[PDB]
Amino acid sequence: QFEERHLKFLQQLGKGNFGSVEMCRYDPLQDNTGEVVAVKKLQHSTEEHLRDFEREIEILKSLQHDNIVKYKGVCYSAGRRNLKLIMEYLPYGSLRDYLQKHKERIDHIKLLQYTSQICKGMEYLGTKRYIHRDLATRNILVENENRVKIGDFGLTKVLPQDKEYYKVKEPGESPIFWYAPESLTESKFSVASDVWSFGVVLYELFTYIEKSKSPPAEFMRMIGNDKQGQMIVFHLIELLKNNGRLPRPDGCPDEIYMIMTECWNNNVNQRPSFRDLALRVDQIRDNMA
Ligand SMILES: N#CC[C@@H](C1CCCC1)n1cc(-c2nc(Nc3ccc(C4CCNCC4)cc3)nc3[nH]ccc23)cn1
Numbered sequence: 001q002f003e004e005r006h007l008k009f010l011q012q013l014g015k016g017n018f019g020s021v022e023m024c025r026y027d028p029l030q031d032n033t034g035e036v037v038a039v040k041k042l043q044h045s046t047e048e049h050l051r052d053f054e055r056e057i058e059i060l061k062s063l064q065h066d067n068i069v070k071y072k073g074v075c076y077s078a079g080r081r082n083l084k085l086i087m088e089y090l091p092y093g094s095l096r097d098y099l100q101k102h103k104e105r106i107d108h109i110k111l112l113q114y115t116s117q118i119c120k121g122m123e124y125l126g127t128k129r130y131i132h133r134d135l136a137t138r139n140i141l142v143e144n145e146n147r148v149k150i151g152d153f154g155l156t157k158v159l160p161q162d163k164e165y166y167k168v169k170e171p172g173e174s175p176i177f178w179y180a181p182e183s184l185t186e187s188k189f190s191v192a193s194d195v196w197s198f199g200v201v202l203y204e205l206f207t208y209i210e211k212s213k214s215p216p217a218e219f220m221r222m223i224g225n226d227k228q229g230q231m232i233v234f235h236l237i238e239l240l241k242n243n244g245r246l247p248r249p250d251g252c253p254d255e256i257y258m259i260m261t262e263c264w265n266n267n268v269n270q271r272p273s274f275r276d277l278a279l280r281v282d283q284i285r286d287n288m289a
Contacts, residue, residue: 001073002026002086007039014094017172018042018049019154023089037072040085050083056153057085059130067121069141069149090149092142096209099137103208108253111205112285114140114148116278118201121150122194123274129159131166131189135197136178137204157189165190176233177215181240182268184233192268198277199263206249206256218246241266255284 006028013021020043027034042049061071070088092098095114099106118140125132133155141151157166169187180196182188200215207213220227222244223235245264248257259280265271272280 002075002084003028004075004077004082004084006030006034007037007075007084010036013038015043016152016154018044019053021087026086036089038087038089039075040087042083045081045083050081052154053083053085056156057083059156059158060085060087060153062128063124063130065121065124066147067117067149068124069151090141090143090151092144094138094151095140095142095148096137096204098142099205100209106208108206108251108256109285109288110145112281112288113146114205115202116281116285117148118150118198119274119278119281122198123278125150125156126191126194126274131157131159131191132194132197133157133189134175134178135194135201136175137201137209140201159190176236177219180268181237181266184237184240190268191274192271195263195271195274195277198274199260200246202256202260202263203246203249206252208249213249215246253284 006026008025008027010023010025013023015021019040021038021040023036024039025032025034025036042053057071057074060069063071069090072086072088075084075086076082118135122132122135132150132153134152135150139150139152141149143149155170157168159166165188167187168189176184178197178200180193183193183196203215211217219236219239220232223232223239227235243266245261248254248260259272259277262272263277
């Protein structure tokens with residue numbers, strides 16, 4: 001629907017693994033009145049990566065929710081390599097950097113507003129049997145001071161018709177410090193592993209993204225910075241099996257930390273649903289207000 005001749009590059013907005021997003025201006029009339037959009041492209045157009053990208057585009061096109069970034073269209077040059085995904089541009093960037101910038105004006109009830117919006121987005125995802133697999137504040141975008149949106153779906157899979165989990169080990173680097181134990185050990189991804197990751201997101205928010213307090217720093221201090229390569233993952237597994245967990249962040253109430261620890265249950269079936277998390281978060285929010 002968008003033709004590449006009219007997309008004018010302004011700057012780079014973010015990079016993941018295998019993809020990047022650029023701020024561009026769609027200006028078909030060539031009079032600087034077109035709208036600013038975000039454009040996602042692959043950094044190395046493999047055909048495996050291209051099929052993954054087509055499936056991701058199909059997933060994002062099928063989602064319509066207040067806390068999910070909006071699909072706008074696609075764009076391809078000759079043949080259909082150079083495939084690009086057009087999305088709405090969200091003016092405040094990712095929640096990670098935003099929260100780092102404004103820690104002095106974001107109080108706990110605002111964090112709980114963000115938490116509840118994320119939970120509604122994730123529950124919507126679950127009703128379509130989608131598993132996000134990459135829930136982290138770096139993947140949350142800020143539309144304005146009162147609204148966040150889930151922003152990337154490059155790792156998202158659809159559950160098989162007959163099972164409640166999806167087994168997958170991609171080559172490349174994996175956000176192992178947001179991963180549930182069963183995802184580290186058996187590469188199993190389910191709604192419950194997304195709930196584990198959501199607990200890590202809650203931790204992130206309440207640390208206000210102090211980098212020494214990031215999940216990687218804390219886990220690597222708990223297992224010792226000696227470890228290299230595979231050993232890291234191995235020790236992580238073993239640390240999670242003896243109920244090692246990230247500590248309560250400074251200033252976090254015990255109710256919030258209890259939500260976190262309940263998401264970090266070793267037993268996949270004993271973890272809360274996203275609807276229950278939304279309820280608990282909304283009642284804490286209403287108690288504070
Ligand atoms: N998710 C997610 C993570 C990554 C994707 C992961 C895989 C590829 C990239 N990522 C997505 C966006 C992104 N950013 C924006 N706006 C925006 C506006 C301003 C700023 C700056 C903010 C502060 N001042 C200086 C400039 C940054 C961003 N809009 C978007 N729409 C769709 C995506 C998207 C940015 N990184």
